[PDB]
Amino acid sequence: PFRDIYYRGQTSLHIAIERRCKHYVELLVAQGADVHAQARGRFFQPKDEGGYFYFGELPLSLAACTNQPHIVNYLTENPHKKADMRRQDSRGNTVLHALVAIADNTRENTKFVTKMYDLLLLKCSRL
Amino acid sequence: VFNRPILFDIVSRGSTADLDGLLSFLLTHKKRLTDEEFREPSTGKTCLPKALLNLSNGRNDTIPVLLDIAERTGNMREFINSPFRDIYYRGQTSLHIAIERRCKHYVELLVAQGADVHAQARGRFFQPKDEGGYFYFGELPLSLAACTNQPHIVNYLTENPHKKADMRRQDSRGNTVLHALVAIADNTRENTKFVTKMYDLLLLKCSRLFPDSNLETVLNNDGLSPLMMAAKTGKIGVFQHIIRREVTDEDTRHLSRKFKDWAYGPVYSSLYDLSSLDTCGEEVSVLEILVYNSKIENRHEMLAVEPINELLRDKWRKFGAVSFYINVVSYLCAMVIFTLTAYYQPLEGTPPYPYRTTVDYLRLAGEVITLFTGVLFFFTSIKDFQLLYFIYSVLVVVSAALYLAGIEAYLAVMVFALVLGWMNALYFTRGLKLTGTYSIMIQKILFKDLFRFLLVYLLFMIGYASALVTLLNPPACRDSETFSAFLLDLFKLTIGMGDLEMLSSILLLVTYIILTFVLLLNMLIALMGETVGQVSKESKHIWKLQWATTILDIERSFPVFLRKAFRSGEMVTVRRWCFRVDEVNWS
Amino acid sequence: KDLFRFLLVYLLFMIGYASALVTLLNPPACRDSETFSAFLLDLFKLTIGMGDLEMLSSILLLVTYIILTFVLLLNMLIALMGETVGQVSKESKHIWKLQWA
């Protein structure tokens, strides 16, 4: 975990997913990584509160907001430790509320948000 | 041969057959190919441009015969670089003609044989369209090959193994290819497409040859450089690209302006360089040129460029907004002091210095403060919209001057300064709450209404008075004695509040006064019609441009070199005072 | 909007015009004997509302200055007229929907 205020708890899993490279993310997760990492940092708060990017403060939500369908599939279907979609955050958003925190009126942004948002509910309901 | 026209006709038609054997009499008469017989009296046009002027699908095969003939004549140097002597043309060597015909085939042959590449078409025709010339291209073959969208020739003309022209070579106005390449730039999409394309081509080429300095460093006689010249001439197309100039090649990456600092998933933070947009007053800056210049044509959209709109807003947040509110409140209190000071100004007549009371001292302070701000304004007006401001400074100075002498009946200027002071106050109040549309409406109606009306106003005075004297030798207006002023006031109330006695208190006078009524009414309606259509809802842009004026107006006020500076940047490999901008994209 | 744009000009001219007035008089037309400016205030209240202002004809700067308040007052009303017409927006057909709900 980082110790800054401009960053915090940004475990290696956060970096690996954000680079949009599942190749090392799965390797990192398989070896055993804290999937319930909490990027409780100033940079990670909404644009209104001084942070540039809010994504739910969870790798699962980070993999969700950033439009990473394959990693969210694996990160919840991986045989090793996995994150429950219900896992809340500082504001209790969970992936669904956070996935709406990055939603935008732009056509393309709403396209994957609504797409993946449906993906999560179907996944969560079955489990 | 026997006469010049036949030689010109023969070469123009491209017939080398009859051209053969002419060398016989050239040697026999020892006449040089550049002699007066081969040159026009006025233009001095030589066979070369004449032959090149009639380029027949790139098949003008008469040129090498002349080149071979020139070699035989023993005078080949002057033959190639043949300068015209007109005013409508000048120095238009054969190289200029060859390139302009968009035929590199003969240009390379001409250059290879040796031509004055640094030719200077210093002619009337070649000046900008504003100065009587139809085409300006930098006044150099390299710039001529650049402006005319000739990529292959500019590549060769600078990469040719023989003599080549350095891109830094200046001209009469010191433009060089880059400034000239911006002199032909146009807002049209296609024109900006090759200009920006080839403009980048030149910088990359110049940088590799001369890594010490980028080509934009060289300044024209006016002292602008491309970006400023594009800024001063309102070339949005080129300009909006120059600021966003990013070069991938590492050796030539340094000459970029839109870096890429970092990205956190879908948020990007491009680190724009603005080494020219803000010089802290050390040197002229694009931002100052872009707002404090009236000749600009595209100001509203030019400000919209990324590190310009954000840059102004950044100044607003820190040291642009607080100093604005310190200005409104401090200035408003100054006038209120002037208002109260004037109101309670010492009564009882003859107030040289009647201050012998506690409240009198407070009034004395009010007069002193207004006197101080009156002269303080004077220094900041001479140091440099300041018109009303300048009039305030002298008038308040005039007031205290007469007062200090204890001379009565000269509070007139002091009060008239006050009304101007509050008229001056229109400036600051404009910059907040999207105000100032009042100010724009005032000036547009100011000049118009007065002389449309006063024309009609006095038009009817004499017109109607002269008809009036028919009934009377000057009663209703002036009993006994000949005046027309009382008639003037009569009309002043006829429309303002009516109640005109007229001579009922003969019919033509009744009919004529009807015209002034209907004429006056519709003019007011037309004035009403003019104003409504003139509002334009501010176009949402006048405030933006006018607002930016306030921020920069404040910045030049206090010493910028102090800790009022935009963000700094790294030292080397990317010591440039860069500025940060952050944009989020989900693509 | 209207109130403090006008009342600013309204009191702006009271003192501005009264101070120019005392040049002719130590305080007649507005207040014979004794120094008040309120009667001047009402004088302007009628100058535009219904006219009929006596002024001191009942020196020229006072005539010129009272011309400014007139032209300044008139165009401000025109600008106020200009502001209102552009502000109507025909309700945009949406304010009623939201307000009705």
Ligand SMILES: CC(C)C[C@H](NC(=O)c1cc2ccccc2s1)C(=O)N1CCN(C(=O)[C@H](CO)NS(=O)(=O)c2ccc(Cl)cc2Cl)CC1
């Ligand atoms: C922080 C200040 C040192 C910056 C500087 N000074 C002032 O503003 C003032 C000086 C004083 C002195 C006595 C009473 C009142 C004031 S207000 C400054 O800001 N500038 C310098 C040149 N300028 C001026 O000299 C006038 C400033 O009054 N220009 S103005 O038309 O009257 C004006 C006034 C307020 C605002 Cl919102 C904008 C403007 Cl266009 C303009 C810009």
